[PDB]
């Protein structure tokens, strides 16, 4: 049910198996591997919870503002364990409006970023790395995800989107043995947090993490982490594939094999089949199977995942007449635009809706993408107006099998033909 319960369980069944490994390239250029077993991770989160239990009361908000790393991980988890509403942010190096919007009772940080945090703040400041982390009811809301508006994320939303997210990676729903999550995505973003911290905990599998800055410094690192003993699965924005393909030289791959990769989800935004294909091509040389790269669609309002392309094969593309499409109708060519074929998910439910009338669009007609599912946030933190406009969509004269609402109005344009979903943007 709960994330801290999921962790509490992992420490029970596989106490001494590696859980999280953070690759630190800050000092060593080849990177130092910092690891915590499930029971070691669970102990630190409890010690963090103890400290937090001395600040405010249940339901209060605790901001996490520290660099990417294991301190960040235990801070987030510790906040949940204490029954506090976590607020994952980055280290402020003028979004000073978030601290004012959530009224946190505490800020969890580290010695490395403390001075930078105070230059932007009275909530209690706790430096997690200075606590004795290894020393031997609750709100439905787990945390706020700031896009700015703060998305209210409940434990249920996370649970559910995780189950859905697992049909995206392995439609067979669990990861085969010896598999591991690899990620450099910032923890303060929806997919870096859900895919990098929550999923491995709820799934009971190991995660190998690093920082976005280390990735920028030497993109090849992302490839290196995916070329090892375990079968890796990762995720990244569309731009990372281009960057990784161009800045990883053939020498960087010396002795590396990519044939063990499971799946690489391609960003929930601005995905291009061109960028993907070009990534597969440059790395085919090192045994990278093009079918492991799969496009995913989503937004924070729906936790993170909404749908992907057919598994077990590369992403199918379909050409549509550009002019007709711009006029609102998907027709076969003869100007041509190529769009990825996303599979209409069973959960959550998706519908193409005319944004002016709130009436469904027939297949082939362009409209706004509406989403219905337990993974949809109930709203924005203390923003009744925005919440209503965004999450209170109601379909008019719904067709059989279609719920009347509530619906999440994504703000994206798309259409459906042959049971397939296509996103325009």
Curated annotation (Swiss-Prot):
Key word Amino-acid biosynthesis present: no
GO CC field: plasma membrane
A molecular function GO annotation: ligase activity
Region span, Disordered: 387-406
Annotated site (Important for substrate selectivity): 195, 298
Keywords, ordered alphabetically: ATP-binding, Fatty acid metabolism, Ligase, Lipid metabolism, Nucleotide-binding
Gene Ontology biological process terms, A to Z: Actinobacterium-type cell wall biogenesis; fatty acid biosynthetic process
Pathway(s) per entry: Lipid metabolism; fatty acid biosynthesis
E.C. code: 6.2.1.49
Function: Involved in the biosynthesis of phthiocerol dimycocerosate (PDIM), a cell wall-associated lipid found only in pathogenic mycobacteria. Catalyzes the activation of long-chain fatty acids as acyl-adenylates (acyl-AMP), which are then transferred to the multifunctional polyketide synthase Mas for further chain extension.
Family the entry assigns: Belongs to the ATP-dependent AMP-binding enzyme family.
The protein's name in its UniProt record: Long-chain-fatty-acid--AMP ligase FadD28
The organism of origin for this protein: Mycobacterium tuberculosis (strain CDC 1551 / Oshkosh)
Gene responsible for this protein: fadD28
């Amino acid at each position: 049910r709960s994330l801290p319960a999921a962790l509490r369980a992992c420490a029970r069944l596989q106490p001494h198996d590696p859980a999280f490994t953070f690759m630190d390239y800050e000092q060593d250029w080849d990177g130092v591997a910092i690891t915590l077993t499930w029971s070691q991770l669970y102990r630190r989160t409890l010690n963090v919870a103890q400290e937090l239990s001395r600040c405010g009361s249940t339901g209060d908000r605790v901001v996490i503002s520290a660099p990417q790393g294991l301190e960040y991980v235990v801070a987030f988890l510790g906040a949940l364990q204490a029954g506090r509403i976590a607020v994952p942010l980055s280290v402020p190096q003028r979004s000073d409006s978030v601290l004012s919007d959530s009224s946190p009772v505490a800020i969890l940080t580290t010695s490395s970023a403390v001075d930078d945090v105070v230059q932007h703040v009275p909530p209690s400041i706790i430096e997690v790395d200075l606590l004795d982390l290894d020393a031997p009811e609750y709100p439905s809301t787990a945390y706020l995800q700031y896009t700015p508006a703060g998305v209210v994320m409940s434990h249920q939303n996370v649970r559910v989107n995780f189950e859905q997210l697992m049909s995206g990676y392995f439609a067979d729903g669990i990861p085969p043995p010896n598999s591991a999550l690899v990620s450099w995505l910032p923890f303060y973003h929806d997919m870096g947090l859900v895919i990098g911290i929550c999923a491995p905990i709820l799934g009971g599998y190991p995660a190998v993490l690093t920082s976005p800055v280390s990735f920028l410094q030497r993109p090849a690192r992302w490839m290196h982490l995916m070329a090892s003993d375990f079968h890796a699965f990762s995720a990244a924005p569309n731009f990372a594939f281009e960057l990784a393909a161009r800045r990883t030289t053939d020498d960087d791959m010396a002795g590396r094999d990519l044939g063990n990769i499971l799946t690489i989800l391609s960003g929930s935004e601005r995905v291009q089949a061109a960028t993907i294909k070009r990534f597969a091509d440059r790395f085919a040389r090192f045994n990278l199977q093009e079918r492991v790269i799969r496009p995913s669609y989503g937004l924070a309002e729906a936790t993170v995942y909404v749908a992907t392309s057919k598994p077990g094969q590369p992403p199918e593309t379909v050409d549509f007449d550009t002019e007709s499409l711009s006029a609102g109708h998907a027709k076969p060519c003869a100007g041509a635009t190529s769009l990825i074929s996303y599979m209409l998910p069973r959960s959550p439910i998706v519908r193409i809706v005319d944004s002016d009338t709130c009436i469904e669009c027939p297949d082939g007609t362009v409209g706004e993408i509406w989403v219905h599912g337990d993974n949809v946030a109930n709203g924005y933190w203390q923003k009744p107006d925005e919440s209503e406009r965004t999450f209170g969509g109601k379909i008019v004269t719904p067709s059989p099998g279609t719920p009347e609402g509530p619906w999440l109005r994504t703000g994206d344009s798309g259409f459906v033909t042959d049971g397939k979903m296509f996103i325009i943007g």
